[PDB]
Amino acid sequence: MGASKLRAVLEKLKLSRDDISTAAGMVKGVVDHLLLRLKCDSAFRGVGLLNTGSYYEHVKAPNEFDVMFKLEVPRIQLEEYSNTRAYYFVKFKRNPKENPLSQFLEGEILSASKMLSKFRKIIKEEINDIKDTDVIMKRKRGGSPAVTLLISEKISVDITLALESKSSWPASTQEGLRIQNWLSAKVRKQLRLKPFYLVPKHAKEGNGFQEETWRLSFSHIEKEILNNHGKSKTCCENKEEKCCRKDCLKLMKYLLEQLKERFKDKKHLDKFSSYHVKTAFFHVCTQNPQDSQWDRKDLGLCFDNCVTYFLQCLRTEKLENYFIPEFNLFSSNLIDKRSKEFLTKQIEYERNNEFPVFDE
Ligand SMILES: Nc1nc2c(ncn2[C@@H]2O[C@@H]3COP(=O)(O)O[C@H]4[C@@H](O)[C@H](n5cnc6c(N)ncnc65)O[C@@H]4COP(=O)(O)O[C@H]3[C@H]2O)c(=O)[nH]1
Ligand SMILES: [Zn+2]
């Protein structure tokens, strides 16, 4: 696949400033209103908008948004659930004083399902006729921590609640974030000093679910790594140091998106998301730390590599969480073999035929 061809694909995917500003405007309005109302409750008094960009989370329908609501919770003690390395029970190190979330305390362990239920109930109750815009809440997805809204019957916004911990990161993230040879150890050091988040996601237990667990989240770190991606600090700040990392990520995401859209009737690709792609891309970034390995003239090659590695992850059924190395996103427990084989087939076909799926 030619680099000029790929860059032409990315070129035709660019949206005008008007659409971006309009959609961002509507989303911002709804979000701000929901914050102002969410602060009416003592449990969600310290709620706030977490900076993850909140834009460009969909190349092309680019009306789908993703915002994250951080909730500052002080002095929490985490307990790793069944060595899942990613799912924890939330407790409090010292709780003599009445906790704002005490209404959600199922004993010593903070209930995730109750907080999520309350959150969803507040939002659902306060998106009706209070807005000079038409907002509807989408059907509750199975085991999804997100609360999705539809604005003006065109804009989708995923709202995820997240507990915030300014404590040091869990021990499961010790060997994670291998950006030493890429973004330097100093950057990793200052990054690990930043807080980490927890989303109300239950873990699988054979043929049952816990609903009391929370999953680690480092979306903000992902944003930071994304916007500052070069070994050189001046990467992509001049013509001589223009790389093709972001182009590769965009192309991968668009490939997965187009494949998911094409086989929407089937249920094979439903569990696959742009996060898997992003993770694989991060691993590839670790494998190729030099900016010279991401030269803009080698877009075709680099992207190819990004495809190949992704395929490897599908074939070997191994895709380690970039922050939690022992957490496998492509385990057989999460995604079945048949789905991964299907995706593999579609991708191999696309690459073998000069990506006809980009022609739309
Ligand atoms: N900003 C943010 N949103 C999250 C996070 N975790 C879940 N969400 C939201 O809930 C939706 C479904 O969550 P799921 O955990 O039940 O299945 C997810 C999960 O299995 C996996 N995944 C996505 N982000 C992940 C993440 N940050 N960590 C671990 N797994 C993740 O891919 C599935 C679909 O992701 P999606 O990006 O299209 O939408 C998320 C996403 O909009 C999160 O950590 N950060
Ligand atoms: Zn760059």
DSSP assignment of 179-248: -HHHH-HHHHHHHTTS-EEEE--PPEETTEE-SSEEEEE-HHHHHHHHHS--SSTTTTSSGGG-B-HHHH
Quickly count: other Cβ atoms within 10 Å of residue 319's Cβ.
Answer: 24
The answer to whether 20 and 55 are in contact (CB under 8 A) is yes
CA 313 – CA 59 distance, rounded (Å): 23
Q: Give the closest residue (by CA) to ligand 1 atom 17.
A: 144
The answer to whether 234 and 241 are in contact (CB under 8 A) is yes
313 CA distance to ligand 2 middle (Å): 25
The position carrying tokens 């093709």 is: 244
The structure's method of determination equals X-ray
CA 193 – CA 200 distance, rounded (Å): 23
Q: What is the DSSP string of 1-60?
A: --HHHHHHHHHHTPPPHHHHHHHHHHHHHHHHHHHHHHTTSSTTTTEEEE-S--S-----
Say if strands 208-209 and 213-217 run parallel, antiparallel, or are unpaired.
unpaired
Mutate which of 64, 120, 157, 160 for ligand 1? The one with the most ligand atoms within 8 Å of its CB, which is: 160
Q: Give the closest residue (by CA) to ligand 1 atom 23.
A: 275
Ligand nearest to the CA of 238: 2
Mutate which of 31, 119, 199, 260 for ligand 1? The one with the most ligand atoms within 8 Å of its CB, which is: 199
CA 110 – CA 38 distance, rounded (Å): 19
Residue 104 dihedral angles phi and psi, to the nearest 5°: -105, -5
86: three-class secondary structure by DSSP = coil
What tokens does 297 get? 């003239």
Q: Residue 25's closest CA among 76, 73, 60, 63? A: 63
Q: Does domain 1-15+169-195+218-360 have CATH number 3.10.310.30?
A: no
CA 120 – CA 310 distance, rounded (Å): 35
Q: Residue 304's closest CA among 348, 359, 356, 241? A: 348
Q: Give the closest residue (by CA) to ligand 1 atom 36.
A: 273
Same fold across 1-15+169-195+218-360 and 16-168+196-217: no
Helix axes 299-316, 3-12, angle to 10 degrees: 80
Quickly count: other Cβ atoms within 10 Å of residue 339's Cβ.
Answer: 17
262-268's contacts with Cβ under 8 Å and 24+ in sequence apart are 262/346, 262/357, 263/342, 263/346, 266/342, 268/338, 268/339, 268/342, 268/343
List the Cα angle 347/352/355 in 5-degree steps: 65
The answer to whether 48 and 35 are in contact (CB under 8 A) is yes
CA 67 – CA 64 distance, rounded (Å): 10
Domain boundaries, the chain: 1-15+169-195+218-360, 16-168+196-217
Spatial neighbors of 352 by CB under 8 A, at least 6 apart, are: none
What tokens does 302 get? 């680099």
Q: Residue 140's closest CA among 158, 127, 125? A: 158
110 CA distance to ligand 2 middle (Å): 42
145 CA distance to ligand 1 middle (Å): 8
Q: What is the CB < 6 Å shell around ligand 1?
A: 52, 66, 68, 143-146, 158, 160, 199, 201, 217, 219, 273, 275
List the Cα angle 287/290/294 in 5-degree steps: 85
List the Cα angle 208/210/215 in 5-degree steps: 120
Q: Residue 296 is which amino acid?
A: R
The position carrying tokens 């009737």 is: 265
CA 339 – CA 95 distance, rounded (Å): 46
The answer to whether 300 and 192 are in contact (CB under 8 A) is no
Whether the CA torsion 124, 128, 131, 134 is positive or negative: it is positive
Helix axes 274-287, 219-227, angle to 10 degrees: 50
Q: Does domain 16-168+196-217 have CATH number 3.40.50.150?
A: no
Resolution in A: 2.6
Q: Give the closest residue (by CA) to ligand 1 atom 20.
A: 271
